[PDB]
DNA sequence: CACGTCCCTCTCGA
RNA sequence: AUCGAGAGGG
């Protein structure tokens, strides 16, 4: 398409890092049968966190991008219906502007 | 002819009399006569003097004749044997009646 | 996607092991004359490769084709009257 | 114009409608062979079955020269011929000849031949 | 949950010019440094990156070194220029 | 050139396939291959006496070969050889070698079994060569010992279970032994002279010991060439040096120091080269590569390109191709050839007094002058190029020279589009040299080739001899082909401009004045030059559109058509009636002048001739087009505009449709969806929803058609049939409609939603892909995308799914090649095997066949008497003396009423016979000789007096007919066998004859005189005797195309409607592929089971039948299953229980809705459970009055040993019904049956369809008709009802995918293929194994798949090719016994002097 | 060797379009090779139209040897074969 | 485990 | 030239 553009590849660490700094429980110490209702966090299709108040973070990150402190190309979804949060610095995603 | 109800010992025991054809049919497929069905036409046995006739009148070799399987649900019904021919009268939409012939391979 | 390959992705592949890697704006080394001020139109007519250059501290490596309007390409910065004078099309 | 073909106004074609330019770009070079023996462009003395005469003595045709069939637009020698004849299927007019050298220093040649295509009965639009 | 859609586009990627070069450069640099570890027994080759890179961008087949049998053929094709939009 | 050789000239009639011996290779070898050196004595152009020309072919054009002195063009080549140091398995015979070693004593050399075993003397009886050798190896690999007697014979060594590692064999003893090449060779050589012969081999042509190569044959250069630029040998000349390199290693490695480990390696290496050399696409193996892979000889020959594209198809001289444009001023059978092509295309004319004067002028004109020549070929034969020869002027031609001259006006040429899926796609036209570089063809010959003039390209071929010439003009001429056997109808007709303006012209409002009329009259070249008296005279001499058109229609034509409400005083100029080549009334449209079954074209080509009609084509294209020129016709966006309260009307239709579909949308949103039976709530919903849009969008397309006046242009083109269809008007002006991808609507690519602009889980029609707007209005951002999705699905059909149908045709054409009617009217193949005994079961040609009606069948028993019965003994029912000449003198005559009975008696014997063959009562079928026409063409001919009586006796009528039938010959013969198949072949035609020549009809409604009658009899006799197919006709390669063309061609016009899908790639292309491959894994096995005879219309019998076969299990009704511990513990169970084992409880709850949905209770469910487990389980259950339907079972470790009982009780426990029968739908079909009054009438009756096929069991059910039952699984029907019963099912399952879209192909074609698979014994699939396995000639079957493999087992079984199949002759370069080759031509000295 | 006698014929008595076509062709090829014309060449030049005139007057000295599947045949003389077409 | 419609037109690379 | 790769046309 005309508007269509392609991702390019971001580094995840400064984004993984801002996750722990704002409410990510590392997978090493996860309490399933204790904190079960916990949306899973996915940085580039890898799972190393979960969160208590998801919607508050989808909004926290969503404005980091719209600001710039997070690159505008990295696409982020929250499957509220499935309590999941996938984030992508992926190189090769076809995105349009809206 | 014997009518085995549900099974027969393979105690093989059939082809054993030279001057006798030892035939066997089951009760399950004989419930409804297959030859009554819409698509099954008249199958007629051919005398050894009819076969030897049709083969020379159509100038044929035995191999060249259309073949009917030995175990054909109709070839057994009529108790066909190897070499027997069967004229077949089907109602065609071009001639009304069309004569075909099959040899029992 | 070419630049993000150039401006970074290069030094990444390097990892005797070598240091930061340097790229030269595209030139060609011809039989006598050595350093030729190689441009797109030049190599386009003359049938040469628009090859940049590879150098890293352990020293020469090879030739990287540059895509036009990219990083190490000249036309990236140049202007209309520049290209017109460069036999290239705006 | 039946069956999705069309009728063209010849009056309007004559006035220039849908007149196309066409270009072709034959190429050749002087090949290097080990003991520094190399090819050479030139009118020779084997030869190709076409009209060499339109060549010059540098093995080239100069621009602005009509050419047809299997005419020679490039004479070369490996006597031992490697002349480049025109496309057996085109009838053009030489436009511009280029000569430079390779990244090996080989004498490099590119002939360009020009023709104006004219909307004909059978052309697609 | 439904079965995962095979042709869902948001899950298929588009390897572009850069990463294509990456795939080429790595398999190449990997083999230049293999020749480096042989130089032990600057006199280190340089065409292996020059030609091996020209090789792919020329054929279209994506190098895979040199012996690329049915492996990535048709990635580098000459540009159409019969119209601007073309 | 090729010089003359004394040697006699023959054709090849036998091709003996066998195998070389190592001794015969040494024999023929013109030179031992000693060196691997290319051709380098000193790398000079002189080659090396070691490889390449040590005596074989020549490498240099300027060099004669060292054997046959002819050099280059003439040198066949000469094979060499290289003695192998160690024997080597042949790559192809590798597996066949093993299959033998498994069969023979690897020590004794004798067979592992012999004639003393019952199965070996049985398998040995099979004289089928390859089926015996398979029936031997099957029962030979097992018995692994050299027995010594067992009632002596013969040492005893056990035989090894052999396996293959790849190029080497091994066998286990108890010993890991790698079986040796020579050791196997030594075993094979010792095989009994008669043992290997009975093993599918041959004593002289294919000994087993030759599947092992002791001496390799080297092919000469011409096989593995070498070209210069310096030189470079061929990929196989390399591979040879590779083999020789691998050999010379063994030669010395084994001569001196024998290191065994090295010896056993360079041998395996050599084995490799010899292996890949022949086949390099092996099973395991790396597959060799030389500086790469390498070209295996097997790869040269693999199908498609490689002797299938070197011999089955060639590139050819005397050919051409260019863009094609359409010409309305050309003649049908012509082709405007550009001048330039006619200067490059020649024809070798022979010099003769007839042409010598023309020929020498051309020569002088030369190769530059249009009507010139190129070459002159002398007595001596060397070619004389007229462009460069000095004597190109003072050259004097001799009689008997050949003058390769330019192709001139009116030569015969082969013309063709390229998708040659048609007998018609290659036609012969008259050349007409013209300017500009386009081929020009008459616009009516477009439809045959399916050509339009948009960058379309057509080939042109040109004959070279006067006989291939006549062959084109006497068979493949365009007008000869005007009526196709494909669909027994015209395949050419008026189209585009001419059609659009011919209804515009043929009107009453349409008048032509004088200045315009004389122009029209002149354009008709065959014009009688007489001005037709004007339909209107005096006010202003005017002419009717049709009136002026009629001078082009040839006097002698009578046509009759009635449309909707067409009267004898046509209301809206309805229907059509042409009398004596002038138009009576009615507008001319597609029906009249198209390629209609009984259209004008069809009638003119039959009752007048092929070339007569052709001139008609032009005579109309020259007039109609001329009129349209000066009337003109256009089309704008104005013609796609209704807007005027019809767009106010249509919009309402789409509004309620969004509510009628919203109705069901909310219904099932609250569960209230009365789900249909079989199709789930979702499936059901959509099916009703999907047609609420398609039935509404299709209702705005007729609302569109209504408003649009008769002055609309888009409307006008469709009314004539020019271009356009009902849908088009709808989509453009009214509404586009739902878009269908993969049949179903637009699905949810996103999670449970169709687009990111749409609500999630939105099922509305706007979301699921319904285009509410038209093309005029313009789609929405969404409407467009979906419409873009649907189109692609189409664009995919038209480009990706065409390879399905092009392949099914290849198979069709390949399994039906040799099939042609023979001189006894048999339809046989290349073996003589009889496929049919008369083509199309009536020996008729498909072109002379027309769909006329047999009035003897359908209708009232009352009206039958009225229309046929003649009672001479009667005052009321006798032929009134006004219709006969002797009505009053024959009134009461009784010796004559005996025949009127005989006649009327055979009419009823007729009527009751037809109703046997055509059970549905359909009375319109195709048969030769249009009688509905002939009587008309006789009333106009003798001018019949509707008043004056007839001069015929009852003696005349009934006896003329009786004698006419005896002369309607199909098979001519003498003995009863053939004569009795005469009666048969005709039988049906005669029914129409007696029907239309009824003595009442002849004199009451036909009014025939005597002359008129006898005329009708004699013409009927010939028009029939013409309709007989001709012995030679390639009916098989024709049915193949006739079946394959519409399939390949239907799936090419799928995007003309974009997202429509329909049954294009739904049940057509798919099922047909199934049908041809047969295949048991049918994708939709259905049993359409008819009810019982009596209570067929009352549902309750069908509702009871439904539950008696639906099949049911525990799994069906069960809700949940629970293992319990309880020895009396369950709450809601403790009540039902007051009415050894194990405390382990098995408690399962059932579904109330489910339980009574199959008319079930509990006791039945239980009693079957008890019965499937007997007294080994304890079972109890509740009641239907109970609140919870539960079954409790105790066993009578056992907690996991009970789960077995549950997962066995669930799916393996059988309640009611028959197995496999997964679904059952009850349906009421309207079947036609004869009312007591005799007339056929529509009485419904209930029928059930299934989703499973267990015929053997479902037919034996009480309460149905076991005579009417039907399953689409023709495979199962062949199994149950016999092959002959299956043949009909096969056809019925073939026709059922043809009659959908492109809904007509003629019985014959389908029946031939159908009969093709049938007449073997069972189903013989149209696939590289199904039919290709027959006993056909070797080369034939290799022209279709398994190409090199087939030629292998041919020479290995010492096969012989008959040379009777077309493919054989094609590969051999001989005229094939095909039509023009089915006979031989001779001159008897007698005749030559009878006309001395 | 075997063959059929002309009193035991059984093939269609008319001329097969393939026979007619190969006879008009055969004679044309022969007529164009300067072979004697047995018909009255009435102002004709084309060697096919001569053969068509030769087949219209049935002055063609050719016999069609119609091979039946069994190997045996039965010649028909061009001049005796009816020409319905 | 072998087929995978038909032709036709150009471009380039060992 | 030959093999391979690709883009088009009907
Ligand atoms: N892939 C193909 N394979 C075989 N034959 C094809 C193929 N594509 C097109 N054809 C043939 O060429 C023609 C294709 O139709 P064409 O491209 O001329 O479009 P059209 O029907 O005129 O389209 P439009 O609806 O735009 O007018 C048909 O005659 C078809 O048989
Ligand atoms: Mg077209
Ligand atoms: Mg078109
Ligand atoms: Mg197309
Ligand atoms: Zn020779
Ligand atoms: Zn023994």
B22 in contact with F at a CB cutoff of 8 Å?
A: no
* Probe residue for ligand 1, chosen from F424, F805, F806, F1052 as the CB with the greatest number of ligand atoms within 8 Å: F1052
Q: How far apart are CA F1192 and CA F1134, in angstroms?
A: 12
Resolution for this model in angstroms, one decimal place?
A: 3.3
Q: How far apart are CA G25 and CA F1375, in angstroms?
A: 14
Q: Are strands F1240-1250 and F1087-1090 parallel, antiparallel or unpaired?
A: antiparallel
Q: How many helices (H) and strands (E) does chain F have?
A: 47, 40
**Is residue F447 in contact with ligand 1, taking CB distance under 6 Å?**
no
**Structural tokens at position F790:** 């649907």
Domain end point (choices F356, F383, F407): F407
Domain end point (choices F780, F797, F820): F780
What count of other Cβ atoms lies within 10 Å of the Cβ of residue E68?
15
- What does each C-alpha distance from E77 to C39, C47, E58, E59, F535 come to in angstroms? 21, 16, 8, 8, 70
Domain end point (choices F780, F804, F820): F780
Helix (H, G, I), strand (E, B) or coil at F1314: helix
Identify the CATH number of the domain in which residue G5 sits: 3.90.940.10
CA of D5 to the centre of ligand 3 (A): 8
- Residue at token pair 């040899």: B103
Residue F559 dihedral angles phi and psi, to the nearest 5°: -135, 150
Taking only residues 17 to 76 of chain G, the set having a beta carbon closer than 8 angstroms to any beta carbon of chain B reads: 68-70, 72
The answer to whether residue F575 sits within a structural domain is yes
Q: How far apart are CA A42 and CA A12, in angstroms?
A: 11
- DSSP 8-state class, residue F800: T
CA angle F197, F203, F206 (to 5 degrees): 90
**Is residue D3 in contact with ligand 1, taking CB distance under 6 Å?**
no
The answer to whether residue F836 sits within a structural domain is yes
D99 in contact with C at a CB cutoff of 8 Å?
A: no
Q: Are residues F887 and F1013 in the same domain?
A: yes
Burial class (CB in 10 A: 0-12, 13-18, 19+), E78: exposed
CA of G13 to the centre of ligand 3 (A): 48
Of the residues F165, F382, F454, F1230, only one is catalytic, namely: F454
F57-63 contacts: CB < 8 A, separation 24 or more? F57/F220, F57/F221, F57/F222, F58/F221, F59/F221, F59/F226
Say if the Cβ atoms of F323 and D122 lie within 8 Å.
yes
CA angle F722, F723, F729 (to 5 degrees): 125
* Experimental technique used to determine this entry: X-ray
D2 in contact with F at a CB cutoff of 8 Å?
A: yes
CA of F1372 to the centre of ligand 5 (A): 22
**Is residue F806 in contact with ligand 1, taking CB distance under 6 Å?**
no
- How many domains does chain G fold into? 1
User: To 10 degrees, what angle do helices F681-707 and F647-667 make?
Assistant: 170
Of the residues F456, F497, F797, F956, only one is catalytic, namely: F456
3-state secondary structure chain D: CCCCCCCCCHHHHHCCCCCEEEEEEEEEECCEECCCEECEECCCCCCCCCCHHHCCCCCECCCCCECCCCCEEECEECCCECCEECCCCCCCEEEEEEEEECCCCCEEEEEEEEEEECCCCCCCC
Q: Are residues F661 and F743 in the same domain?
A: yes
Q: Are residues F493 and F609 in the same domain?
A: yes
* Probe residue for ligand 1, chosen from F323, F326, F417, F419 as the CB with the greatest number of ligand atoms within 8 Å: F419
Q: How far apart are CA F846 and CA F1029, in angstroms?
A: 8
Residues F575 and F633 sit within 8 Å (Cβ to Cβ): no
Q: How far apart are CA F65 and CA F71, in angstroms?
A: 5
Residues F1164 and F1107 sit within 8 Å (Cβ to Cβ): no
Nearest Cα to F1273, choosing from F1310, F1323, F1328? Answer: F1323
User: Could you give the count of Cα atoms lying within 13 Å of F602 in the half-sphere of its Cβ?
Assistant: 26
Region for F1174 from its dihedrals, namely left if φ exceeds 0, alpha if ψ lies in -120 to 50, beta otherwise? left
Q: Which protein residue's CA is at the shortest distance from atom 4 of ligand 1?
A: F419
Residues C35 and C48 sit within 8 Å (Cβ to Cβ): no
Q: How far apart are CA F516 and CA F563, in angstroms?
A: 31
Burial class (CB in 10 A: 0-12, 13-18, 19+), F1306: buried
**Is residue F1052 in contact with ligand 1, taking CB distance under 6 Å?**
yes
Domain containing A24: what range?
9-90
- Strand H nucleotides with an atom less than 7 Å from a protein beta carbon: 2-8, 10-14
What element of type H or E holds F899? helix F894-917
Q: How many helices (H) and strands (E) does chain B have?
A: 2, 6
Q: What letters, b where the CB count within 10 A reaches 16 and e where it falls short, cover B54-83?
A: bbebbebeeebbbbbbeebbbbbbbebeee
- Which atom number of ligand 1 is nearest to the Cα of residue F1049? 31
Domain containing B44: what range?
33-105
Say if the Cβ atoms of F977 and B54 lie within 8 Å.
yes
The answer to whether residue F262 sits within a structural domain is yes
- Which atom number of ligand 1 is nearest to the Cα of residue F454? 18
Q: Are strands F346-350 and A46-51 parallel, antiparallel or unpaired?
A: unpaired
Ligand closest to F728 (CA) is 1
Q: Are residues F851 and F903 in the same domain?
A: yes
Residues F1164 and F1215 sit within 8 Å (Cβ to Cβ): yes
**Structural tokens at position F1042:** 């006739």
C12 in contact with A at a CB cutoff of 8 Å?
A: no
Identify the CATH number of the domain in which residue B62 sits: 3.90.940.20
Say if the Cβ atoms of E13 and A8 lie within 8 Å.
no
Q: How far apart are CA F96 and CA F107, in angstroms?
A: 19
Residue F191 dihedral angles phi and psi, to the nearest 5°: -65, 135
Nearest Cα to F12, choosing from F1392, F1376, F1271? Answer: F1376
CA→C1' distance for E20 and H14 (Å): 24
What element of type H or E holds F334? strand F334-338
CA angle F1307, F1313, F1317 (to 5 degrees): 135
Q: How far apart are CA F189 and CA E83, in angstroms?
A: 73
Residues D118 and D21 sit within 8 Å (Cβ to Cβ): no
Residues F372 and F393 sit within 8 Å (Cβ to Cβ): no
- Cross-strand bridge partners of residue F821: F827
CA→C1' distance for F1039 and I4 (Å): 40
The answer to whether residue A95 sits within a structural domain is no
Residue of chain E with shortest Cα separation from C3 = E18
Nearest Cα to G4, choosing from G60, G61, G66? Answer: G66
3-state secondary structure F626-693: HHHHHHCCCCCHHHHCCCCCCHHHHHHHHHHHHHHHHHHHHHHHHCCCCCCCCCCHHHHHHHHHHHHH
CA→C1' distance for F734 and H12 (Å): 51
The answer to whether residue F705 sits within a structural domain is yes
Cβ-Cβ contacts under 8 Å, A90 against chain E:
13
- DSSP 8-state class, residue A84: E
CA→C1' distance for F676 and H5 (Å): 42
Ligand closest to F1053 (CA) is 1
- Residue at token pair 């066993």: F1195
- The minimal CB distance from G68 to the residues F352, F354, F823 is found for F823
Nearest Cα to F1171, choosing from F1137, F1207, F1209? Answer: F1209
Q: How far apart are CA F469 and CA F428, in angstroms?
A: 10
Q: Which protein residue's CA is at the shortest distance from atom 29 of ligand 1?
A: F450
The answer to whether residue F882 sits within a structural domain is yes
**Structural tokens at position F256:** 């001196």
Residues F159 and F145 sit within 8 Å (Cβ to Cβ): yes
Q: What letters, b where the CB count within 10 A reaches 16 and e where it falls short, cover F872-892?
A: beeeeebbeeebbbbbeebbe
**Structural tokens at position F1221:** 């029968």
Of the residues D4, D28, D58, D71, only one is catalytic, namely: D4
CA→C1' distance for F332 and I1 (Å): 45
Nearest Cα to F595, choosing from F447, F723, F420? Answer: F447
Nucleotide whose C1' lies closest to the alpha carbon of residue F1048: H5
**Structural tokens at position F571:** 């209301």
What element of type H or E holds F982? helix F976-996
The answer to whether residue F297 sits within a structural domain is no
Residues F1243 and F1091 sit within 8 Å (Cβ to Cβ): no
Q: Are residues F1304 and F1376 in the same domain?
A: yes
Identify the CATH number of the domain in which residue A22 sits: 3.90.1070.20
The residue of D96, D103, D107, D108 whose CB has the most chain C CBs within 10 angstroms, and thus the best one to mutate to test that interface, is D103
Catalytic annotation present for F1329: no
CA of F236 to the centre of ligand 5 (A): 19
Distance of residue B91 Cα from the nearest chain F Cα, in angstroms: 5
CA F360 to chain centre: 50
- DSSP 8-state class, residue E51: H
Q: Are residues F643 and F776 in the same domain?
A: yes
Q: How far apart are CA G80 and CA D119, in angstroms?
A: 60
**Is residue F454 in contact with ligand 1, taking CB distance under 6 Å?**
yes
Q: Which protein residue's CA is at the shortest distance from atom 27 of ligand 1?
A: D4
Q: How far apart are CA G46 and CA G32, in angstroms?
A: 8
Cβ-Cβ contacts under 8 Å between E and F: the total is 6
F298-302 contacts: CB < 8 A, separation 24 or more? F298/F91, F298/F92, F298/F1348, F301/F1347, F301/F1348, F301/F1351, F302/F1347, F302/F1348
Q: How far apart are CA B85 and CA B66, in angstroms?
A: 10
Whose CB is within 7 A of strand H?
D 89; E 55, 58-59, 78; F 302-304, 309, 313, 315, 321, 418-421, 457, 799, 802-803, 806-807, 810, 1048, 1328, 1345-1347
The protein residue nearest H5 (Cα–C1') is: F806
Domain containing G64: what range?
1-85
Residues G54 and G24 sit within 8 Å (Cβ to Cβ): no
- How many domains does chain F fold into? 9
Residues belonging to the binding site of F are 65, 68, 75, 78, 105, 108, 146, 155, 452, 454, 456
N-term to C-term CA, chain B: 21
The answer to whether residue A4 sits within a structural domain is no
Say if the Cβ atoms of D98 and C30 lie within 8 Å.
no
Catalytic annotation present for F454: yes
CA F965 to chain centre: 35
Domain containing F526: what range?
482-634
């Amino acid at each position: 398409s005309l508007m269509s553009c392609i991702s390019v590849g971001t580094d995840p660490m400064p984004i993984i890092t801002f996750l722990s700094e704002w409410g990510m429980e590392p997978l090493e110490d996860y309490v399933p049968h204790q904190s079960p209702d916990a949306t899973r966090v996915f940085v580039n299709g890898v799972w190393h966190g979960v969160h208590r108040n998801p919607a508050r973070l989808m909004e926290t990150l969503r404005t980091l991008r719209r600001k710039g402190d997070i690159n505008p190309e990295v696409s982020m979804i929250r499957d509220i219906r499935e309590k999941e949060l996938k984030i992508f610095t992926d190189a090769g995603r076809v995105y349009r502007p809206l | 002819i014997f009518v085995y109800q549900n099974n027969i010992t393979p105690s093989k025991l059939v082809p054993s009399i030279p001057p006798a054809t030892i035939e066997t049919f089951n009760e399950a497929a004989l419930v409804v006569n297959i030859t009554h069905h819409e698509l099954v036409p008249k199958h007629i046995r051919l005398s050894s003097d009819e076969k030897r006739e049709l083969l020379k009148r159509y100038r044929l070799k035995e191999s060249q004749l259309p073949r009917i399987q030995r175990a054909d649900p109709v070839a057994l019904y009529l108790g066909l044997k190897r070499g027997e021919v069967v004229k077949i009268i089907r109602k065609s939409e071009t001639s009304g009646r069309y004569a075909s012939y099959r040899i029992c391979m | 996607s070419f630049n993000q390959f150039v401006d970074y992705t290069l030094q990444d592949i390097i990892c005797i092991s070598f240091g930061k890697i340097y790229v030269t704006k595209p030139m060609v080394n011809e039989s006598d004359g050595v350093t030729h001020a190689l441009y797109p139109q030049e190599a386009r007519l003359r049938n040469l490769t628009y090859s940049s250059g590879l150098f890293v501290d352990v020293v020469f490596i090879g030739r990287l084709p540059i895509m036009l309007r990219s990083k190490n390409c000249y036309l990236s910065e140049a202007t209309e009257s520049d290209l017109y004078k460069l036999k290239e099309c705006p | 114009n039946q069956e999705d073909s069309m009728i063209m106004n010849q009056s309007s074609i004559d006035r220039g409608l849908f007149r196309s330019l066409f270009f072709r770009s034959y190429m050749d070079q002087e090949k290097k062979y080990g003991m520094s023996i190399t090819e050479t462009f030139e009118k020779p003395q084997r030869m190709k079955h076409g009209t060499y005469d339109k060549l010059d003595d540098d093995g080239l045709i100069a621009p602005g020269v009509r050419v047809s069939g299997e005419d020679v637009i490039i004479g070369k020698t490996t006597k031992r011929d490697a002349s480049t004849p025109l496309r057996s299927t085109e009838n053009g007019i030489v436009d511009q000849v280029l000569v430079t050298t390779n990244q090996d220093g080989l004498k490099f040649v590119k002939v360009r031949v020009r023709t104006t295509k004219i909307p004909q009965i059978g052309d697609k639009f | 949950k439904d079965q995962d859609d095979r042709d869902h586009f948001g899950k298929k990627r588009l390897d572009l010019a850069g990463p294509l070069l990456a795939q080429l450069f790595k398999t190449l640099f990997k083999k230049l440094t293999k020749d480096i570890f042989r130089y032990m027994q600057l006199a280190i080759n340089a065409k292996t990156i020059t030609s091996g890179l020209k090789y792919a961008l020329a054929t279209g087949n994506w190098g895979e070194q040199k012996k690329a049998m049915s492996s990535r053929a048709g990635v580098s094709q000459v540009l159409n220029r019969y119209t601007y939009s073309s | 050139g090729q010089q003359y050789s004394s040697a006699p000239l023959r054709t090849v009639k036998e091709v003996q396939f066998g195998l070389f011996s190592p001794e015969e290779v040494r024999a023929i070898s013109v030179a031992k291959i000693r060196f691997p050196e290319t051709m380098d004595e000193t790398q000079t152009r002189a080659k090396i006496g070691g490889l390449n020309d040590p005596r074989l072919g020549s490498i240099d054009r300027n060099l004669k070969c060292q054997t046959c002195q002819e050099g280059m063009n003439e040198c066949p080549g000469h094979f060499g050889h290289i003695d192998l140091a160690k024997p080597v398995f042949h790559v192809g015979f590798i597996a066949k070698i093993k299959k033998v070693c498994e069969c023979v004593c690897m020590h004794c050399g004798k067979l592992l079994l012999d004639e003393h075993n019952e199965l070996m003397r049985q398998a040995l009886a099979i004289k089928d060569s390859k089926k015996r050798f398979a029936a031997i190896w099957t029962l030979c690999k097992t018995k692994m010992v050299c027995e010594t007697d067992v009632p002596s014979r013969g040492c005893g060594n056990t035989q090894p279970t052999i396996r293959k590692d790849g190029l080497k064999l091994v066998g286990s003893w108890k010993e890991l032994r790698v079986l040796s090449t020579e050791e196997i060779l030594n075993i094979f050589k010792h095989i009994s002279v008669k043992d290997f012969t009975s093993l599918g081999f041959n004593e002289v042509f294919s000994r087993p010991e030759w599947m092992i190569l002791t001496c390799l044959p080297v092919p000469p250069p011409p096989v593995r060439p070498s070209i210069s630029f310096q030189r470079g040998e061929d990929d196989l000349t390399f591979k040879l040096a590779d083999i020789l390199k691998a050999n010379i290693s063994l030669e010395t490695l084994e001569h001196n120091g024998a290191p065994h480990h090295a010896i056993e390696e360079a041998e395996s290496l050599l084995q490799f080269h010899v292996a890949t050399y022949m086949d390099n696409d092996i099973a395991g193996q790396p597959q060799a590569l030389q500086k790469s892979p390498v070209k295996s000889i097997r790869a040269r020959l693999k199908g498609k390109e490689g002797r299938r594209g070197n011999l089955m198809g060639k590139r050819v001289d005397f050919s051409a191709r260019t863009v094609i444009s359409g010409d309305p001023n050309l003649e049908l059978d012509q082709v405007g050839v550009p001048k330039s092509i006619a200067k490059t295309l020649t024809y070798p004319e022979v010099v003769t007094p007839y042409n010598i004067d023309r020929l020498t002028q051309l020569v002088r004109n030369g190769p530059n002058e249009h009507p010139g020549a190129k070459y002159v070929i002398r007595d001596s034969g060397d070619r004389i190029d007229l462009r460069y020869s000095k004597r190109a002027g003072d050259i004097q031609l001799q009689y008997g020279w050949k003058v390769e001259r330019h192709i001139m006006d009116n030569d015969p040429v082969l013309f063709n589009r390229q998708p040659s899926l048609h007998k018609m796609s290659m036609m012969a036209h008259r050349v007409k040299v013209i300017p500009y570089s386009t081929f020009r063809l008459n616009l009516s010959v477009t439809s045959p080739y399916n050509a339009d003039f948009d960058g379309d390209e057509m080939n042109l071929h040109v004959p070279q001899s006067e006989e291939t010439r006549a062959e084109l003009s006497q068979l493949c001429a365009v007008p000869l082909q005007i009526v196709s056997p494909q669909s027994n109808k015209p395949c050419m007709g008026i189209v585009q401009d001419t059609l659009c303006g011919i209804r515009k012209l043929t009107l009453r409002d349409t008048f032509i004045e004088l200045d315009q009329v004389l122009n029209m009259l002149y354009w008709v070249p065959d014009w009688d030059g007489v001005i037709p008296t004007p339909a209107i005279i005096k006010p202003k001499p005017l002419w009717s559109g049709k009136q002026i058109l009629s001078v082009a229609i040839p006097n002698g034509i009578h046509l009759q058509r009635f449309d909707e409400g067409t009267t004898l005083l046509s209301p809206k100029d309805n229907g059509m009636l042409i009398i004596d080549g002038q138009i009576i009334f009615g507008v001319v449209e597609k029906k009249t002048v198209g390629s209609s079954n009984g259209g004008l074209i069809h009638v003119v080509t039959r009752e007048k001739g092929p070339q007569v009609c052709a001139k008609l084509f032009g005579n109309i294209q020259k007039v109609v087009n001329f009129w349209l020129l000066h009337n003109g016709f256009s089309t704008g966006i104005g013609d796609t505009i209704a807007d005027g309260p019809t767009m106010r009307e249509i919009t309402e239709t789409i509004a309620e449709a969004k509510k009628k579909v919203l109705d069901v949308t909310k219904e099932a949103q609250a569960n209230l969806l009365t789900a249909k039976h079989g199709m789930t709530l979702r499936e059901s919903f959509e099916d009703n929803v999907v047609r609420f849009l398609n039935e509404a969008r299709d209702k705005a397309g007729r609302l569109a058609e209504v408003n649009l006046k008769d002055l609309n242009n888009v409307k006008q083109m469709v009314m004539a049939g020019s271009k356009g269809s009902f849908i088009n008007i709808a989509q453009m002006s009214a509404c586009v409609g739902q878009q269908s991808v993969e049949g179903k609507r637009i699905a949810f690519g996103f999670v449970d939603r169709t687009l990111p602009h749409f609500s999630k889980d939105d099922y509305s029609p706007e979301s699921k892909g319904f285009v509410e707007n038209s093309y005029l209005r313009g789609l929405t951002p969404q409407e467009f995308f979906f419409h873009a999705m649907g189109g692609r699905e189409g664009l995919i059909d038209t480009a990706v799914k065409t390879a399905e149908t092009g392949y099914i045709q290849r198979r069709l054409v390949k399994a039906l090649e040799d099939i042609m009617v023979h001189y006894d009217n048999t339809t046989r193949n290349s073996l003589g095997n009889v496929i049919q005994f008369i083509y199309g079961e009536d020996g008729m040609d498909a072109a002379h066949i027309e769909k006329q009606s047999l009035d003897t069948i359908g209708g009232s028993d009352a009206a039958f008497e009225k229309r046929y019965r003649v009672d001479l003994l009667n005052t009321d029912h006798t032929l009134d003396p006004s219709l006969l000449e002797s009505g009053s003198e024959i009134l009461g005559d009784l010796k004559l009423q005996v025949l009127l009975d005989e006649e009327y008696k055979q009419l009823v014997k007729d009527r009751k016979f037809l109703r046997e063959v055509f059970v549905d009562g359909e009375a319109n079928w195709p048969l030769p000789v249009n009688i509905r026409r002939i009587i008309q063409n006789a009333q106009q001919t003798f001018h019949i007096d509707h008043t004056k009586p007839s001069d015929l006796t009852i003696k005349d009528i009934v006896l003329g007919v009786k004698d006419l039938q005896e002369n309607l010959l199909v098979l001519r013969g003498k003995n009863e066998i053939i004569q009795n198949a005469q009666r048969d072949a005709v039988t049906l035609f005669c029914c129409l004859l007696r029907s239309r020549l009824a003595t009442r009809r002849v004199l009451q409604e036909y009014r025939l005189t005597k002359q008129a009658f006898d005329w009708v009899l004699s013409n009927i006799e010939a028009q029939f005797l013409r309709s007989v197919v001709h012995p030679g006709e390639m009916v098989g390669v024709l049915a193949a195309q006739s079946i394959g063309e519409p399939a390949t061609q239907m799936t090419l016009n799928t995007f003309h409607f974009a997202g429509v899908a329909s049954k294009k790639v739904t049940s057509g292309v798919p099922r047909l592929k199934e049908i041809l491959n047969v295949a048991k894994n049918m994708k939709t096995p259905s049993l359409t089971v008819y009810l019982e005879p009596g209570h067929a219309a009352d549902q309750e019998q069908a509702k009871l039948i439904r539950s008696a076969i639906e099949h049911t299990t525990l799994k069906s009704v069960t809700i949940a299953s629970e293992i319990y511990y309880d020895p009396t513990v369950i709450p809601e169970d403790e009540e039902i229980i007051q009415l050894q084992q194990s405390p382990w409880l098995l408690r399962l709850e059932l579904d109330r809705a489910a339980m009574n949905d199959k008319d079930l209770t509990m006791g039945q469910v239980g009693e079957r459970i008890k019965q499937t487990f007997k007294n080994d389980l304890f079972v109890i259950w509740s009641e239907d009055n109970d609140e919870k339907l539960i079954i409790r079972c105790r066993v009578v470790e056992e907690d996991h040993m009970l789960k077995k009982i549950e997962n066995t009780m669930l799916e393996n426990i059988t309640l009611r019904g028959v197995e496999n029968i997964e679904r059952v739908v009850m349906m009421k079909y309207d079947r036609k049956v004869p009312s007591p009054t005799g007339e056929y009438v529509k009485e419904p009756e209930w029928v059930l369809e299934t989703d499973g096929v267990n015929l053997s069991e479902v037919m034996t059910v009480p309460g149905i008709d076991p005579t009417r039952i039907y399953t689409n699984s023709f495979i199962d029907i062949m199994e149950v009802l016999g092959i002959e019963a299956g043949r009909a099912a096969l056809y019925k399952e073939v026709y059922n995918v043809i009659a959908s879209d492109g809904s007509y192909v003629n019985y014959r074609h389908m029946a031939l293929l159908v009969d093709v698979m049938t007449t073997q014994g069972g189903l013989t699939s149209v696939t590289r194994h199904g039919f290709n396995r027959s006993n056909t000639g070797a080369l034939m079957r290799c022209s279709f798949e398994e190409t090199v493999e087939i030629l292998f087992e041919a020479g290995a079984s010492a096969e012989l090719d008959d040379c009777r199949g077309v493919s054989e002759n094609v590969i051999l370069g001989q005229m094939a016994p095909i039509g023009t080759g089915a006979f031989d031509v001779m001159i008897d000295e007698e005749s030559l002097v009878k006309y001395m | 060797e075997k063959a059929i006698p002309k009193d035991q014929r059984a093939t269609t008595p008319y001329m097969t379009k393939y026979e007619r076509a190969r006879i008009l062709g055969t004679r044309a090829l022969q007529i164009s090779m300067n072979a004697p014309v047995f018909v009255d060449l009435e102002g004709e030049t084309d060697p096919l139209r001569i053969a068509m005139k030769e087949l219209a007057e049935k002055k063609i000295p050719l016999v069609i040897r119609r091979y039946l599947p069994d190997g045996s045949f039965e010649d028909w003389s061009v001049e005796e074969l009816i020409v319905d077409l």
